[PDB]
Symmetry: D2
Subunit: 509 residues, 4 copies
């Protein structure tokens, strides 16, 4: 997938693509002038013997002291070497890549004052599929992607290590792989590379994509459970949704009618489609899932903007010759988006679990008192029904927001931070919880529909049944179930059901 | 303030007005046809001997059993009498009113099948300033505003009690005050009155308004602290914000430049406006407060929509002659908005506290090591600086989201609920925490600027100084401070500083 | 109730008594020597021209500078005047009193270096039922009960205000009421009065007592629901509990067998007492309530110790002539106890709610599908069953611990604090949630047993039925229920059911 | 390490040993009679044609229906096969082993009615170092260790897979390795193996051990930082601690005096040991760490008891010939212990972080404004100081308790559960956060003391310096730090500093 990048125009779709697979990129020519221009600004500042913080001053107490021009190259290197004090397991190549591409997009907007040749270097590591070692922990989402970003730049200066073809090489052997040589940095270039919200942004983005995949899956899964228990379609009537006027819900109901259709053999084979009321977990799916869609749409907007943001410091405005110190490196926005996404992920998992319970019960579904065929011979999946409770419950605590916490770092000058990295990181596990839950819904609904011998559900829903059944057989009775769940989870993770959702509903899809 | 209501067109401003003070309303004539029409639909259903759930069936197991037409009037009354099982202190007249006006707006959209004369009754209690007894607790944000809504309708049937001129009268003496008589209800009218998201919506709305008032105040307060410590204005440079591309932050910075202006006597009296970097708590105000503005804007949209929503069940579509049972009574959306608003309220309080700390410190401000004049003679407000820490910390726990919790009610048919009432209720206390924090910032900044003898800050900021000083004197030293805070809180609560913020920034303002 | 206090020997029972009602106290003569002795130590330090921090140094930067002896009296007064920067509503007389008695107990251990005449003053305000104004907020549980304690001492120096006979008098008119005159303080006496963990300790203690009252009530209530639904007694078999070896549970089961007895008319009237298994919410009561008892016993121990603790600074050891600065003013222990107690309170509320649900369901009880007599005529308390869900759910968020939060105060010298005040304060509301829940259980079980015409439960349980029925009639059908709950709550709050629990189970009882 | 097990006498030390390394065990002869006896009870129940739930009834609706005696062997197998519906990664051999040994201890108390030959089988898999596949997720801590326990028993019946010499074999090849053959089960044996609190108990135990290791480490680390910044020893004066009367704190102070001694070259080289007050993070170490010790001691007691508990159902009392159904399988106690331990782990991490901050600051330590040697040349570890903030902050959210959550499983008969597995699982990550924090403290203090050329600290503390320096060199300046942290973490994880703490302080140590 070749991209000709025009900085700051990244869409969430492209971001999905970048997160998902290898990317080949090159810059758009419209890019060259602003980048090159911001460098000449920095360059003339130096030459006019002027002194500017972030450009040619020292740091802290010395933030006021000029650094010998020839002293400047060692500053960079000291900055990079010093900040790589992260901790944890190393990010998978996917996230690295994404972060690499986000930093590139960001620098290339020509507000950062670093040479194109340095940007060009990053791009070359991207194109070569060489991914610098980045550890999961250390950043508080304020003062630049500081460790993760430092760990990234290490390889550029022939330091640290990088992964290639799944093997750890040296920052040197790997630079060569990319057709490069160890690089030396100039004024501002140290602060340009190490500062930004890219790490936290990639974390939050992965969570959004995850939240997105679960959403889609949940519409297919909730559609089967409606059928499995011979539920109504009336809860999906467009008019009820337009009368509430909630868009998330409006679009969600629409998605539901699309997948279920006006009726099915299954649905048609039950006298009427009204009688007894359906339980909230069925009936209020548009409302709840609808609320969830809104949530993930709000975050997506914030995150869509941040992915193209000029997030370093200080920023250089070559047109006016100004260099300004701000705080764009503060990822509060991103943190809140991550926290936002937590609620949607949890509540999708919550609703699916109650549908599982419904299904297993001696009614809430209208099938076997457990699906199997007697609580006394065996006792089917009342149990997988327990596993989903355990996963759903977890997400309740994981929902605790991180954007409200903060610790005064490095001498109460850095007296308020975001915690965006942790806000976002936790969504990944939250999505695993919700994914196992749905998988169990998926397996349960298909088991149940199965019991309704020879009957068929909607066209999209029969596709969802077949997707499962292509890899997991009907579990009609006593035998080790864990491996069914395990398999269902994978298919979900491979986006098995994603294609059934109508297009343009989800931000990145 | 007279309003001629056109149902479902309520703006957040009008809602602010309704929440804030007595409202006189009447319906717009364009209203009459749909309302009257939905009634005739219900009415013809009855007459054609047809039986429809929510209209003329029983409930639960009997949800399938027709109720003798003449039996129907007692159903209503039984519904109302039965659901008023709430708990807690009674809502203040303000919230009652708001809820009353939201239910009225909702019913009048003519999807609810209840007589105009019943709507007219509600409106008359509004116009008369007669507020039925509603207790704070009982609702789970699903199955209709059920208790609070039941407690409301009680007065209509000459039951319960209502508050008038701050006194509890009987639902009878109070009905009369409104020029009314006890009412009898007809088919569907019981479910129309008791079902809806109005209670939770009013709770969340009050929180939004609160969050809004704090925001504004926080821009004035953060502006004074910048001055108090001779901070920079460069962090507010429009260009840095447009380069990030975040709107919340863009608008926030703009608000800051508006209040501070390019410079002040105070600011002008300090050699330069660059030198040492400002601490995050100063520098990253656009970023953080900007993130907060976004948050409260997202919720406002959801809540703005819900205030005009047709939230009862089942809904009647007279044009097609259809009566449909959905789940619009599920307040998931509202719950998430409330949870959303929690983060903004907390983080506004968080940033203000670190500014207080900065100010009290032997620097972070550039004034007295505590503001007073020596930690050894007395020791000023290092302490009020402690009180703000206690209030800020609280909001960290209060931020725990309620929209992720749910309990299966009334026999796992109501197997998923929202918890919207609690999500929203908790914001009120959260705003008190943040308001005390800011008050202390307000008092501190004015104390500090004071110390800079005879110097003046911006025009809007001098207005903020004077607003304080008009009621709270300079606290130049040893004497009981609590009463300063107490006073500052009130002024804040009376919206003292709200008028300084530029117009059209905040949803309801 | 006259007490002759021997400092540091307070029991939790006496503390319950002090919290619960007016106390008359006087010191034990064994007290005089250590108190008087610590004063003479301070006094000789002064006279030997020695200089000691906390005794005769300044504060902060000046913590190293000696204060003119004649300057010392104004230090006290400055300390008191300065720290009273609290916020919130004023504590009820009960809590004030308790705090007053805890500070008295503490000082009197003769480690604090303050005159008996000053202690004597406090005691006189206690004996006279004069309660100084203390606001709920401001303290972070570290650096002395600082504001609340300052607000307390205000009255002593003829400042602030005090409540007497429920009226706010002046610290002067109120001092006189106590037979006193405004007092002047000496070296160390300022730090002795304002520093300590008494405020947080009283907060946590009130929560413990609350948690205690709920526990007892929950054994009576859970006993009725077992009967109401014709549950088994076998889950209470001593042998099952001794086999687990958990003491909390062992004692809890014992309490259950005591209240239910081997059998009842009710229980005897059902063929057997085995058949179908009982649901966890019945069967696992010893286990869950047992876990809860342990929790509240652990906290009680910590809190029992803290109530007698010498918590000021610095401390004076007259025997060796030493004055030492420590940090006993850090209430971490208390904070954790408060957080501890949160889990017990929540989980008691949680189990009671599921018993309500069980009862309302068309089984889980064996009575009316809702208790009333048809979901279709009326529909009874399926609803009060909703109110309990709302109260139970709240406690889930309120359980979020405060002892994990901390903010660096007054210049990172006070860089770690406890947050004990908030940890404890929140339990009070948590107990209201759980109390409403139980009240609803209480009312429901009695309603249900009622339906079993003319049948009787255990002797203690019939007492519990009668306690209710003495004030709340059988609610056999359609009519306003809220007022039933309201009434039940009160009785619970008046400890109505507390006397049925066997003695010596609960720490303070 | 050979053990001759006398059931239910396990100590926490032995449990530490079992968790930590391979165990060889055999039963004590005193064991044989009760085990064998409970079997004959079950056996005679069968033979007398009597029917008993859990023994020879069906399940659920059929819980009342007798199972053909010859039908019974297939019941077991169906039970096992059915409940293995867990999810997640497989537990490490350590935890498996521990769980295996806990179930063995439990069954062997002869209340479970299963043959010794079946117990003997488990023991043989333990002795052979063959560890059945157990996935991390699925259990809600109620209804028996159900999935994890089912997954365990799978191998016994020649199903599933087991790990041996770090390789996954078949339950068959692995049974053989243990010298076994696939087993068939009899009455009650299915419920005896699958039911219990062992899984959650092992999870919580690992957390306790972790919490224990961190505690010790934190005393050594906090001792070095006191020295690094030339802090006082007076805060550790026994008298201050006895005056508070808190035991945790009393023992903690004692531990501190033991490690620091009355004085050191370092301490001796600073004029006095009083002057300026130390910051809370130093001074209040006994108080905070003391509160933490209490917390972990409380949990340990509960967990110590649970490890020896008879936790299955129903239980058999051969002496009286009774078979009783209780609910000992409800792990509420364990859940609360796990939640309890969370607070200690967090607060240990919290205090260490503020000590790091202190150290890095241009004071709070008295060393380099960052440790390195100028914020302007390089800038040392102000950064690792950031990494610790990120880890400490995480633990704030992870502290959210799981014992307050619950979901009604398998048809509201299982209407209240514990969530003990998740309460405990989360402590492991929480300990990683706190361990990285301390590691960074460790590295920082040693770096700082280093700067005090040629000076020495206490004898135990010099051992702690050397432990580090044996593997991590002084990091005197600019170069990649991450690998220092990485290394320090490992040493901590290998219990490097554990041996310095005086004996008998910690429950398991």
């Amino acid at each position: 997938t070749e991209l000709t990048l025009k900085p700051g125009t990244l869409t969430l779709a492209q971001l999905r693509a970048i997160h998902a697979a290898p990317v080949r990129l090159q810059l758009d020519a419209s890019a060259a002038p602003a980048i090159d221009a911001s460098v000449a600004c920095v360059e003339q500042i130096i030459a006019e013997d002027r002194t500017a913080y972030g450009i040619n001053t020292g740091f802290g107490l010395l933030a006021s002291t000029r650094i010998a021009s020839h002293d400047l190259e060692n500053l960079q290197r000291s900055l990079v070497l010093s900040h790589a004090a992260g901790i944890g397991a190393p990010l998978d190549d996917d996230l690295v890549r994404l972060i690499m591409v986000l930093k590139i997009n960001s620098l290339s907007r020509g507000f950062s004052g670093i040479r194109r040749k340095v940007i060009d270097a990053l791009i070359a590591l991207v194109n070569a599929e060489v991914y610098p070692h980045i550890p999961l922990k250390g950043s508080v989402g304020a003062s630049g992607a500081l460790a993760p970003l430092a760990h990234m730049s290490l390889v550029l200066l022939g330091e640290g290590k990088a992964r290639y073809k799944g093997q750890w090489l040296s920052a040197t052997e790997a630079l060569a792989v990319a057709g490069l040589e160890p690089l030396t940095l100039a004024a501002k270039e140290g602060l340009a590379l190490l500062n930004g919200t890219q790490a936290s942004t990639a974390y939050a983005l992965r969570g959004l994509f995850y939240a997105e995949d679960l959403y889609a899956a949940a519409i297919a899964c909730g559609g089967l459970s409606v059928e499995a228990v011979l539920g109504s379609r009336s809860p999906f009537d467009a008019r009820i949704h337009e009368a509430r006027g909630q868009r998330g819900q409006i679009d969600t109901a629409a998605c539901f009618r699309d997948l279920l259709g006006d009726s099915s053999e299954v649905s048609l084979s039950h006298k009427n489609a009204d009688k007894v009321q359906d339980p909230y977990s069925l009936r209020c799916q548009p409302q709840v899932m609808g609320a969830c869609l809104t949530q993930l749409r709000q975050a997506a907007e914030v995150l869509g903007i941040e992915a193209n943001a000029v997030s370093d410091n200080p920023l250089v405005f070559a047109a006016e010759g100004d260099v300004i110190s701000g705080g764009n490196f503060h990822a509060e926005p991103v943190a809140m988006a991550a926290d936002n996404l937590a609620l949607a992920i949890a509540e999708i998992g919550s609703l699916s679990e109650r549908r599982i319970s419904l299904m297993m019960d001696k009614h809430m579904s209208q099938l076997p008192p457990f699906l199997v065929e007697n609580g006394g011979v065996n006792s089917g999946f009342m149990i997988a029904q327990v596993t989903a409770a355990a996963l759903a419950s977890e997400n309740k605590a994981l929902s605790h927001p991180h954007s409200v916490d903060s610790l005064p770092t490095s001498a109460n000058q850095e007296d308020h931070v975001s915690m965006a990295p942790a806000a976002g990181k936790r969504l990944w596990e939250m999505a695993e919880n919700t994914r196992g839950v749905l998988a169990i819904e998926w397996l349960g609904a298909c088991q149940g529909l199965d019991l309704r011998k020879g009957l068929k559900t909607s066209a999209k829903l029969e596709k969802a049944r077949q997707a499962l059944r292509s890899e997991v057989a009907h579990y009609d009775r006593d035998r080790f179930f864990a491996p069914d769940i395990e398999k269902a989870v994978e298919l979900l993770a491979k986006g098995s059901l994603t294609g059934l959702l109508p297009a343009g509903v989800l931000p990145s899809l």
